[PDB]
Amino acid sequence: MMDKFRMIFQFLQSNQESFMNGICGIMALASAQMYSAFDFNCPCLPGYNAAYSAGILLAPPLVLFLLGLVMNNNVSMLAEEWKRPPGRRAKDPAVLRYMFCSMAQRALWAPVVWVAVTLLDGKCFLCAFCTAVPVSALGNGSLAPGLPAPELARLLARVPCPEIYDGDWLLAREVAVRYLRCISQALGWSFVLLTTLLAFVVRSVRPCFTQAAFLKSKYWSHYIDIERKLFDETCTEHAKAFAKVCIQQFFEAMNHDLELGH
Amino acid sequence: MMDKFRMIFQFLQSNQESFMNGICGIMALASAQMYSAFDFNCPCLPGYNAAYSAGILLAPPLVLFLLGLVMNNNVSMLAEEWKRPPGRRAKDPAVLRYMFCSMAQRALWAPVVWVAVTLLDGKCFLCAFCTAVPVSALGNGSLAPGLPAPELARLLARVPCPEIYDGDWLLAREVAVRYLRCISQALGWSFVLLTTLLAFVVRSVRPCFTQAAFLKSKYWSHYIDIERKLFDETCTEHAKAFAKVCIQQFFEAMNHDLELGH
Amino acid sequence: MMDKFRMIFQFLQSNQESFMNGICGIMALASAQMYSAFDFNCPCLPGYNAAYSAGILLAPPLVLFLLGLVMNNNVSMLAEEWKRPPGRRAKDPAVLRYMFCSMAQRALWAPVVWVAVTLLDGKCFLCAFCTAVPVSALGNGSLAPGLPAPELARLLARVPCPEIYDGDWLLAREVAVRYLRCISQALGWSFVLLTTLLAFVVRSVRPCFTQAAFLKSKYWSHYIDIERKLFDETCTEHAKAFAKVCIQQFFEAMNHDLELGH
Amino acid sequence: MMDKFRMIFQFLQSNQESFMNGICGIMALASAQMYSAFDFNCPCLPGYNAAYSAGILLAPPLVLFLLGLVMNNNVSMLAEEWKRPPGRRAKDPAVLRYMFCSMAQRALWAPVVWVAVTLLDGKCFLCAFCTAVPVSALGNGSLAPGLPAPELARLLARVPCPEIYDGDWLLAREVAVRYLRCISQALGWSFVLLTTLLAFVVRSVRPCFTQAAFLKSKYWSHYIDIERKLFDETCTEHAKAFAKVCIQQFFEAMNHDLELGH
Amino acid sequence: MMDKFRMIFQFLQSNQESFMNGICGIMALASAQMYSAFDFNCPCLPGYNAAYSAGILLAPPLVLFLLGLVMNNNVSMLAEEWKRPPGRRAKDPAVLRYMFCSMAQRALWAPVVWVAVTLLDGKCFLCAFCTAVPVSALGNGSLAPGLPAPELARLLARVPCPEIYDGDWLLAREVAVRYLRCISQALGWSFVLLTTLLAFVVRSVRPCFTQAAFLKSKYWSHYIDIERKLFDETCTEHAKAFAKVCIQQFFEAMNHDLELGH
Amino acid sequence: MMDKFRMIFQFLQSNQESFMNGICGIMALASAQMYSAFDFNCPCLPGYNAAYSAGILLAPPLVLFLLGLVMNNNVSMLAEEWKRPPGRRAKDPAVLRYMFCSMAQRALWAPVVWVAVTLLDGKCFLCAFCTAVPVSALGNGSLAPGLPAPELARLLARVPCPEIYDGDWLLAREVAVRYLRCISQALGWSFVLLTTLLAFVVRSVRPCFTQAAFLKSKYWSHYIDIERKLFDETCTEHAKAFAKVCIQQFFEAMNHDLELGH
Amino acid sequence: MMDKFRMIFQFLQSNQESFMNGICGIMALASAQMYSAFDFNCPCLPGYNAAYSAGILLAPPLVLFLLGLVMNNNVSMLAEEWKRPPGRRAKDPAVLRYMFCSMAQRALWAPVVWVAVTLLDGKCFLCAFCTAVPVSALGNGSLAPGLPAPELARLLARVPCPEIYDGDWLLAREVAVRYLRCISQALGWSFVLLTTLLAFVVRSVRPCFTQAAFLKSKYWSHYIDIERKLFDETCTEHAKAFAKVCIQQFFEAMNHDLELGH
- How would DSSP label each residue in E105-165? HHHTTSTTHHHHTTTTT-HHHHHHHTTS--TTTT-SS-S--S--STTTHHHHTTTTSSTT-
Provide, as residue numbers in chain B, all residues whose Cβ is less than 8 Å from the Cβ of C247.
none
Hey, is the C-beta of A186 within 8 angstroms of any chain C C-beta?
yes
Provide, as residue numbers in chain B, all residues whose Cβ is less than 8 Å from the Cβ of D138.
45, 154
Nearest-CA distance from B242 to chain D in Å? 9
Q: How many helices, marked H, and strands, marked E, lie in chain A?
A: 11, 0
**Identity of the residue in A90, A91, A215 whose CB atom sits nearest the CB atom of E250:** A215
Measured torsion, CA atoms of residues G113, G115, G116, G118, in degrees rounded to the nearest 10:
120
Nearest-angstrom CA–CA distance, F229 and G239: 13
> Using the beta-carbon criterion (under 8 Å), do A259 and D212 form an inter-chain contact?
no
Helices B3-14, A3-14: inter-axial angle, 10-degree rounding: 10
Provide, as residue numbers in chain E, all residues whose Cβ is less than 8 Å from the Cβ of G260.
90-91
**Identity of the residue in E90, E91, E215 whose CB atom sits nearest the CB atom of G250:** E215
Give the helix/strand (H/E) hosting G49. Answer: helix G48-55
| Selection from D40, D39, D56, D42 nearest residue D156 by Cα | D42
* Residues 6+ away with beta carbon under 8 Å from F51: none
**Which residues in B21-58 are b (16+ Cβ under 10 Å) and which e?**
eeebbbbbbbbbbbbbbeeebbbbbbebbeebbeebbe
Q: What is the resolution of this structure in A?
A: 4.7
CA angle D114, D117, D118 (to 5 degrees): 85
Nearest-angstrom CA–CA distance, B72 and B80: 15
> Using the beta-carbon criterion (under 8 Å), do D215 and A250 form an inter-chain contact?
yes
A194 by Cβ neighbours in 10 Å (0-12 / 13-18 / 19+) ranks as exposed
Give the helix/strand (H/E) hosting C81. Answer: helix C75-83
Provide, as residue numbers in chain G, all residues whose Cβ is less than 8 Å from the Cβ of E216.
254
**Which residues in E38-50 are b (16+ Cβ under 10 Å) and which e?**
eeebbbbbbebbe
R_g over Cα of chain D: 30
| Selection from C102, C110, C99, C100 nearest residue C22 by Cα | C110
> Using the beta-carbon criterion (under 8 Å), do F230 and G240 form an inter-chain contact?
yes
> Using the beta-carbon criterion (under 8 Å), do A240 and B223 form an inter-chain contact?
no
Task: Find the distance separating the first CA and the last CA of chain D, reported in whole Å.
Answer: 74
Nearest-CA distance from D16 to chain G in Å? 19
Residue type, G2: M
**Identity of the residue in G90, G91, G215 whose CB atom sits nearest the CB atom of D250:** G215
Contact indicator for C140, C28 with CB cutoff of 8 Å: no
Hey, is the C-beta of F181 within 8 angstroms of any chain G C-beta?
yes
Residues in chain F: 262
Enumerate residues 231 to 260 of chain G having a beta carbon within 8 A of any beta carbon in chain E: 250, 254, 258-260
Hey, is the C-beta of B151 within 8 angstroms of any chain D C-beta?
no
How far, in whole angstroms, is CA D45 from its chain's centroid?
Answer: 30
A114 by Cβ neighbours in 10 Å (0-12 / 13-18 / 19+) ranks as buried
Provide, as residue numbers in chain A, all residues whose Cβ is less than 8 Å from the Cβ of B219.
235, 239
Task: Find the distance separating the first CA and the last CA of chain G, reported in whole Å.
Answer: 74
Contact indicator for B35, B2 with CB cutoff of 8 Å: no
* Residues 6+ away with beta carbon under 8 Å from C93: none
Distance (Å) of CA D152 to CA D43, D130, D174: 16, 12, 18
Residue D120's SS3 state is coil
Hey, is the C-beta of F211 within 8 angstroms of any chain G C-beta?
no
Hey, is the C-beta of F40 within 8 angstroms of any chain E C-beta?
no
* Residues 6+ away with beta carbon under 8 Å from A95: A213, A216, A217, A220
* Residues 6+ away with beta carbon under 8 Å from C38: A120
How far, in whole angstroms, is CA F51 from its chain's centroid?
Answer: 22
E and B adjacent (3 or more CB pairs under 8 angstroms): no
> Using the beta-carbon criterion (under 8 Å), do C216 and F259 form an inter-chain contact?
no
**Identity of the residue in E172, E178, E190 whose CB atom sits nearest the CB atom of F43:** E178
Provide, as residue numbers in chain D, all residues whose Cβ is less than 8 Å from the Cβ of B34.
7
DSSP string, chain B: -THHHHHHHHHHHH-----HHHHHHHHHHHHHHHHHHS------SSSHHHHHHHHTTTHHHHHHHHHHHTTSTTHHHHHHHHHSPTTT-SS-HHHHHHHHHHHHHHHTTSTTHHHHTTTTT-HHHHHHHTTS--TTTT-SS-S--S--STTTHHHHTTTTSSTT---STT--STTTTTSHHHHHHHHHHHHHHHHHHHHHHHHHH-SS--HHHHHHHHHHHHHHHHHHHHHHHHHHHHHHHHHHHHHHHHTTSS-SS-TT--
Nearest-CA distance from E189 to chain A in Å? 39
Minimum Cα–Cα distance from F259: chain C residue: C90
Nearest-angstrom CA–CA distance, B107 and B24: 8
Q: 10 Å Cβ neighbour count for A213?
A: 20
D227 by Cβ neighbours in 10 Å (0-12 / 13-18 / 19+) ranks as middle
Contact indicator for E114, E26 with CB cutoff of 8 Å: no
How far, in whole angstroms, is CA F164 from its chain's centroid?
Answer: 34
Provide, as residue numbers in chain F, all residues whose Cβ is less than 8 Å from the Cβ of C215.
250, 254
| Selection from B150, B155, B148 nearest residue B133 by Cα | B155
**Identity of the residue in E178, E204, E218 whose CB atom sits nearest the CB atom of F79:** E204
Experimental approach: cryo-EM
> Using the beta-carbon criterion (under 8 Å), do C247 and A230 form an inter-chain contact?
yes
Nearest-angstrom CA–CA distance, G115 and G118: 5
**Which residues in C237-255 are b (16+ Cβ under 10 Å) and which e?**
eebeeebeeeeeeeeeeee
- The chains found to touch F (3+ Cβ pairs under 8 angstroms) are C, E, G
- The chains found to touch B (3+ Cβ pairs under 8 angstroms) are A, C, D
> Using the beta-carbon criterion (under 8 Å), do D254 and G212 form an inter-chain contact?
yes
Contact indicator for D4, D36 with CB cutoff of 8 Å: yes
Nearest-CA distance from G259 to chain E in Å? 6
φ and ψ at residue G95, rounded to 5 degrees: -65, -30
Contact indicator for F133, F170 with CB cutoff of 8 Å: no
CA angle F215, F217, F221 (to 5 degrees): 125
